[PDB]
């Protein structure tokens with residue numbers, strides 16, 4: 131209890147919010163949830179193999195893609211084992227288990243004490259009953275032309291990551307009145323309260339008060355009787371209360387049915403959220419914690435025709451953004467049992483239920499009992515994600531989604547993780563199938579767990595609307611990850627807290643860069659190192675990598691908007707095969723939550739291309755948003771911007787020259803072996819970024835924001851606020867790019883023919899998952915793009931994907947998007963140089 135009192139304070143500094151401070155609660159839902167998450171936590175902590183949890187092999191069941199077999203000559207792989215400068219390369223079959231590889235080294239090449247293969251310089255192990263081809267690090271080594279180096283050392287002790295012991299009346303609501311301490315608005319106004327009964331973005335019923343003058347205190351004492359009956363209220367229905375003046379000024383919500391299935395009784399004083407200027411924050415059950423500046427509100431509570439089948443199939447086959455008319459919904463419902471045979475159709479089918487009708491909901495639940503086909507069908511994440519978005523508030527409907535997620539291997543959980551955590555924002559209750567799912571998979575696997583921690587912590591630090599809910603989920607996870615990880619997270623938290631201070635301090639001291647600031651960093655960073663900064667820590671975007679000491683020599687305040695710090699660290703693992711530093715950018719000013727979502731979709735796309743045996747060489751570098759307009763950014767080594775390569779020859783301003791990029795490429799490559807591979811890396815990376823950026827609607831960029839490695843890998847950066855008559859481009863395929871591919875004006879070459887053909891395989895590969903990208907894009911805007919003015923913004927994604935327009939016209943459409951880039955030349959790019967200078 132005295133020892134347990136301190137532990138909670140340790141949990142609190144890890145979490146970033148105190149899950150016991152009950153100043154901002156009007157019921158016990160959070161505590162009920164903190165209490166409810168004890169079973170699933172203990173049930174997973176007790177269920178996980180201690181060894182395989184401790185070493186956490188990162189593996190996959192997916193086939194080794196075509197492009198990685200072609201890299202394997204004569205069906206063998208070259209493992210380079212190490213020990214104490216005793217290297218020895220070994221030929222190994224792709225299907226060889228790691229235990230059966232130590233058998234080749236120890237038992238052959240020259241009771242027992244069992245050891246394991248760790249990757250040199252990394253907390254990454256090659257253990258467990260998996261073929262060597264199926265470990266991702268191995269695949270990573272193949273894809274980038276690297277060589278698999280490993281140390282033969284002892285397993286980590288499973289003891290280190292153990293845990294501490296533990297009526298038919300019409301519904302009515304009385305609006306007493308509203309209360310703001312200071313009415314800021316300049317002129318006099320009038321105001322009314324709007325009370326909506328909502329279920330999953332549908333307003334079932336609506337009342338309004340009479341308008342009264344806008345004063346610091348405004349009382350009504352009016353009963354608002356609704357059309358809906360108490361019997362007819364579905365679990366997860368919200369009382370959404372809103373203040374208007376015609377303009378929405380304030381909102382707050384309250385679950386009419388609580389977490390014990392009780393109707394909500396009694397007096398409530400709800401502190402409300404103010405409105406800037408839809409958005410996941412609109413939907414929160416959380417009240418505003420700021421009890422001194424926030425508007426308050428006070429209330430009190432108490433077989434068919436072919437024509438129709440074809441009409442049904444044409445509806446089931448439409449994208450998720452295609453609306454349903456009244457006519458469509460009545461068909462889906464009337465033929466619900468025929469609709470139940472088509473998983474593709476569940477989202478539209480469940481959007482056709484009248485949730486405000488107790489008898490229909492009953493019929494919907496018996497209908498959910500006969501879901502044999504849904505269960506057997508192969509997991510579609512696109513379809514699954516869709517039943518977990520803002521349009522579905524029924525927990526049983528959502529359960530089926532999370533059910534299908536149970537099938538995911540860790541590797542895939544990692545792809546969709548970021549947006550699964552964000553999807554918790556659409557849960558009506560703090561305790562849900564999804565929140566528990568995230569908890570289990572986090573507890574089951576340290577890699578999932580690592581990123582769960584940071585994704586949750588990301589939101590806890592910058593969302594008043596959802597911090598509490600996520601805090602309960604993070605706490606739950608932290609209480610089962612073990613002492614070791616608690617130790618890593620604490621170390622990592624200390625570092626980023628330590629380094630955020632410097633980032634903000636340095637920013638204050640300069641509105642170009644000064645000599646006094648450059649030494650200020652030198653000194654301040656020289657200080658932190660002395661003894662306060664931990665010895666080493668996990669890099670939060672690459673948890674297998676442990677940063678050690680700072681390379682103060684290499685650190686500087688960057689000469690760019692918002693004065694980010696360019697920091698570099700020596701690796702803390704001596705078995706690392708280099709003295710090459712770990713580069714991190716620390717920035718305040720940009721909303722790096724947006725970058726996270728965008729980079730994670732890029733990773734999603736690379737995975738969609740692996741399915742169709744494509745590899746478009748994206749470099750979605752690490753990004754972790756750690757607070758409000760603040761976070762870190764991985765440094766991709768050996769890279770420079772396209773704008774600066776132009777500026778290295780042409781100069782600080784002028785006409786951009788087409789020859790420069792190809793000279794820069796050739797000037798860096800040492801041979802006709804590398805350069806011509808570098809050119810092949812460019813053709814591919816350029817295509818990928820051209821396609822990905824086009825579909826995401828962020829293809830029109832200043833080439834100061836496009837980069838290239840000294841090996842041909844092209845990649846974009848800085849993705850915040852890019853989603854906002856003037857000239858436009860679909861993507862950046864400028865004449866300098868084409869020059870590398872061997873074309874000029876409206877000409878053509880073999881490398882450009884490969885470009886054109888790569889883009890088309892890419893663009894059609896993404897169109898194969900139209901729905902998936904639509905859901906992920908729609909969710910991204912609601913949960914992470916503030917300034918989400920309209921759903922119209924979402925409809926960009928369907929246009930770009932050319933929904934309902936055959937494979938072949940789609941080949942054409944995208945070929946002509948390229949042709950617009952060839953026509954526009956340097957002009958749009960010339961306008962950005964102007965724009966980023968012509969204030």
Ligand SMILES: CS(=O)(=O)N1CCc2c(-c3cnc(N)nc3)nc(N3CCOCC3)nc21
Pocket residue numbers: 688690715717720725751763764765766767769770771837847848849850
């Ligand atoms: C070209 S630079 O002068 O070195 N510079 C200026 C800004 C910047 C960024 C960056 C990334 N994201 C965001 N939001 N802001 C800046 N990111 C990066 N990198 C990120 C990828 O690795 C290469 C370096 N470099 C930046």
